[model samples]
Target: YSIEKLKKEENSLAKDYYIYRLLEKNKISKKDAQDLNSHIFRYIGKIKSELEKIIPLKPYINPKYAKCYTYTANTILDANLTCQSVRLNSLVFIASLNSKDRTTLAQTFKNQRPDLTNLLLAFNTSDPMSYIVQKEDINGFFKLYNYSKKYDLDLNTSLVNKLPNHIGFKDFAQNIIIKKENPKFRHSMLEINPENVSEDSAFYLGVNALTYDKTELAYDFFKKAAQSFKSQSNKDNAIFWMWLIKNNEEDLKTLSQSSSLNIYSLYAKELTNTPFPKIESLNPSKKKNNFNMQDPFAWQKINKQIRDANASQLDVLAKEFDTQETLPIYAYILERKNNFKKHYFIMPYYDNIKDYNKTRQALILAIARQESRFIPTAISVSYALGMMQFMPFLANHIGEKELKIPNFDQDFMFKPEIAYYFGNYHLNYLESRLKSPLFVAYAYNGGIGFTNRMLARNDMFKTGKFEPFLSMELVPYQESRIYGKKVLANYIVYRHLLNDSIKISDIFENLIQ
Candidate 1:
């Protein structure tokens, strides 16, 4: 297809990539290059206006469009950083949407673009020193120092005094600032004044205080955090910690009834002696509608339909799904009536995984339930595919080298048997090194390397104050931290359901191997 014939690619980001490549190759005219740039600007404008209408960022933006949003704004800024609206909104968009790549993007605006120093410093406060050392003279040191104070982080005074040393700051930031450990930094954050600390700062300070056995101070800090936190997860976490300090009966009841499903709530349920919510086991005979689970397209159609349906529509579709025998969708529909705990706890594919030992079988069900709720064709925001949520690269690697297929197809993972096979194969490698189900989960969601690095840390997962629970909360990656806990909860529940029950307290009793 002609680049001229088709003015825009289906993906706005792809069009930008193609335009840049052609411009570099000198195939497209300079005027056409300008036209493509203008189109990107217009698309961003449309996206921004559309986004403004919704007031929801991630939900409205969609994770698949993460790179597109970052790059379009980047291309516009790189080409002309003087465009003030794009300049300001670019920072907001990147900081909000493109967090994992924040440091990578900040490097471009460092010494390469001095005019953006304060802006870069403000947006990428994760690495405040990067902007501080950008030869902006006196102003940027104060820029870096202010953030350190704001976020309750420690400053490298030497870097503040001797920045712009040509080669020294770059390497030092790489070795010291960028790859710095969280535990020591958090310990230093214990010094933040309670009266002045930010809401975000207060939560970590509260945890740090807990590690030091400062219950009264930690309670006050967590109270500040619970009152100020924007996310429900953080609020629940604060509430959970406060309950831990006092062990109040009413607080325990409140924790048990919170909207979010978390380690705290699960613990509260256990402490309160509340029974796990009732869930129906999958019934094979009820699947009379001949719903084929193997077809990705069929699952996709129902998946979207189920997502956007009303309460009435959900009831109708749940019955339709019962007839179709797509129990995962049927189970998912139960969540509309406050049945997530019920919906997610079912074992849909035990027959396929029956060959494994009881322990392995339970772990597989636990992981599958958490990863995709047993949706055969489920896709993650990170582009992970199918029941096991394997990344494309990992799936391709396994398909070719391990599974011995000539040309790998990711769609094969949409089949339950294949996902189970691949998942079992992957878990064997994980199980070889990790003993506890909790560690295996951390390794699976985060990488094995990440899990290893975390375990090797002198400050975490040790037999000290708070021990595993504190380490669980402060694992650096929020996704991995919650994921490890959720899977642990699932593992416990599945083992009970499988009649090989394990105590949650027993699992964490000696979490360290």
Candidate 2:
């Protein structure tokens, strides 16, 4: 009954009193402050509004806040939510698929569905138009704007003609565009060529299985995927699969000995051929009922700080695929970037820096890492963009037509400067309203208002630090919560490596003070 009641009352935040207090104390006095505050509030409010719209609408069965909702809704509207010109100036899909394979790709999007209640809880406000613009979801945006304009209900002015080209958006308010100059990334693209969607079904399955930690399942999927790609005249996936299996010898051995179990095959071919296996059926003989998957040795030195600082809470971090191909780059970047610093010396006189402080850059870079792992054209099912993951509608508000930000498409996220700029801009906006990095980080992950409410009631301030980035409790969504810590940790590390000798732990320790 208690749990049921809590679920019933989960709509509004529990920190009502604290929210009122913070709003009151930080209440806007001048037009500038009010405008800023309103922008911040409306920014998140708009997200809630859109998220709510799609949950109850269609095809999103009990949608939670997963990627399916975003991708599905946009797909329904025929909007370019996942394209450049919207999230970034470009997009790069590294798969062995045909460009026109919408059916398969669209179905793939469905596999990321969220629970419905979680979807509804994300909405707020009656302004449906604002919701449409919450993301750069052009179809939805164009449709909503058309509806509002038809009724004369005041459409967002800047978004008026943004349908075709991204021309006119200012530099300070742009999204990143994807680029494919890197040979490694370009090589990966050969497998992802849109003309051969069917060619890559096998490779895609293999890569995905690896990501989900289904070694035996992954092996099966990879073998099948390898065949598929090979049938489509691609030999790399098969070779890579072999290399992958050979490299992960331990995982393969374990997979060989494990009981045959099946997972719900999202791949249509798998579903057609075999039954979905229960998690236990895959590894039935593990004697111990509990599957405690902690790897102390795998937790590197930097992770030690995270483990120590978070103690019991550390295990919750998302388990990334420990692939040889992916991990090396990730580790190298994480290691060196931990010590590299941005040019702080340029801060004092820079026009942009004059208004926002150095923390803004730190927080922005941290958020970029958190959102996209620095993937310039990374697209999420969430309709977020670039390194900073701004929604299309949000990007319109921030970008100017004068800067020519190109129209909504996957191609736009590759513009490095634009990605960095808007990412920083959004971070600055978030930083102004919430308690520094913790709350801002939470906002990035959980939506601004959602995190705000969480911090207000959760007593997440155990560290007594107002900075939400450092406050582990400030975020509720598991991904964002851990991401906040990792990103903040990254900032500390990045700063230490790039700027001065200040250590990562020192930043957190100081934030608490």
Candidate 3:
């Protein structure tokens, strides 16, 4: 084609691309869409030799009058004429997106062609430090970290230190952040002075003391906490710990039936072999629109409204649900709104997963609740993906070895069904090796190697006396320690919800052992 003819054709291609993208993204208003045909398109292009990439043209498009264009019009024309010419066009497309710091575009590349983006990063090895810093790309840094780890690239530590303390970076850091302890509670005694500790600190100090089998020390700290605490919850928790050691039957029974549904009260009931009292309903005074559970579309509508609505609207929504039956749904909505809770309705999966094994299912669902709040697409900055949050390497290994699925890739982990399947499978695998579900939970979050090392360093396995709760308290990794506690709390609640007749201590034989 002649140069003038080529220019006109290239301009037309760019205009079409821009219009399609604008409509796809809902970027234009109703009036703009109506008048789109009447719009004047302006083309501003460089000489073919000077052009290096194809810029996304959508942002520059206006239905009334706008300049919408990109580079490599020649490449675009060649891509249409020859199959082999498409790779150059793809490269130009990524270059444009990367230059714009368009992560959404990166996601598009990931969805369409995952292998290509890694290659793009592999070859383009200039300091990512500047781009991530300039754009404040927290997710970008994590993606780079994962990429480098996978490819064995040495990411500059100086660049990483410069990264802002962000939630994304926090998630990534937790996976690699090592604990100061030697994978166990240090052998040296922890001398906690009752005078130095406050009510809250006293409870924690007591728990720590119990980890080393210091029963008298634990009781003293618990006594101090119980006497000084004003809050009913705090006092009950402290007294419960004391009861664990003292076994004051009558007083423990009284505390168990105190009408407060919490961890401590539940444990007290276990000691007394009492059935769980009926859980009190939240039961709001005012009621508004009730959620229609029959229609799947109703869920989407309410969920969207909950996400988009501001604080006032959220308060209004909160008032709509009255009973305990509805509260779980409301809790899910609140979780979506970023008001995260310790527990919520496990929903559709609870029925299916519960049938696997009641106790096992409860633990699995509990971990999932804490891991991702039932959000299937949830991803940690550590590249742990899906509802169960399995790391890519683990997922790939499990997929091939346990499930016998050949050539399973990381993308397969994102599916909720598959994620849950692997989650349950992994839990079962761990349980087979380590009898205690609590221990399995620890191994799941922190590596099995770490768990074994920790247990070996303690007197539990060596003396045939295990302290499950104390072991949890002494977990070396701060992240895993907190995670195990949250999951444990979740498990207790879920187990109660399933069968309130049983106590957590009854299930965990090693609670006091």
Best by TM-score: 1
Better of 2 and 3 by TM-score: 3
Candidate 3: list runs displaced more than 4 Å: 1-193, 207-217, 223-237, 246-263, 277-311, 315-330, 334-345, 350-355, 400-409, 461-469, 492-502, 510-513
Top of the candidates by lDDT: 1
What Cα-based lDDT does every candidate model obtain?
A: 0.64, 0.38, 0.55
lDDT of 2 by residue, 1-513 (tens): 122232332222222211222343443233323223222222343333433333322343443334433433234334343431122111112112233342333343444422211112113234544544544444543333333332122234344334333222211011101111222322222222222233334344344344334455445645555445533212332333443455554433333222221110111113133222221111112232222112111223323344354423322321231222233223323333333222111111124333444456566555665565544444444445554666655666667553455564322443446666666766667877875565577677767877666656634454532232223422335477556656665465344333433333344444442
**Candidate 1 lDDT, 310-387, residue by residue in tens:** 878888887777733477777777766444444357777668898788888889988998898888877654446788
Local accuracy of candidate 3 as per-residue lDDT tens digits, 1-513: 222232243223223333433444455455444433333233233211111122233443445322122334333322332232233234344443343233332344565554443434433446553444344444554555554432122234344444324344433332332232221212221353565455655666576566567888888878888888877656876777787777777658767876554566777776677776553233444444455443223443555677788888887776665434345456666554544422243443454475676777777877887786665555453546667889767987888776778778665765656877899888878888776666777789887998778777744433323345444545667777767656766688777677643457654565333
Instruction: Report the candidate with higher TM-score, 1 versus 3.
Output: 1
Considering lDDT, where higher is better, how would the candidates rank from best to worst? 1, 3, 2
Model 1 bad stretches (over 4 Å): 1-202, 211-213, 224-236, 253-261, 271-274, 280-285, 288-292, 337-343, 405-408
Q: How many residue pairs clash in each candidate?
A: 1, 81, 0
* Model 3: how far residue 44 lies from native, Å: 40
**Candidate 3 lDDT for residue 150:** 29
RMSD of 1: 12.0
**Could you give me the TM-score of model 1 versus the true structure?**
0.64
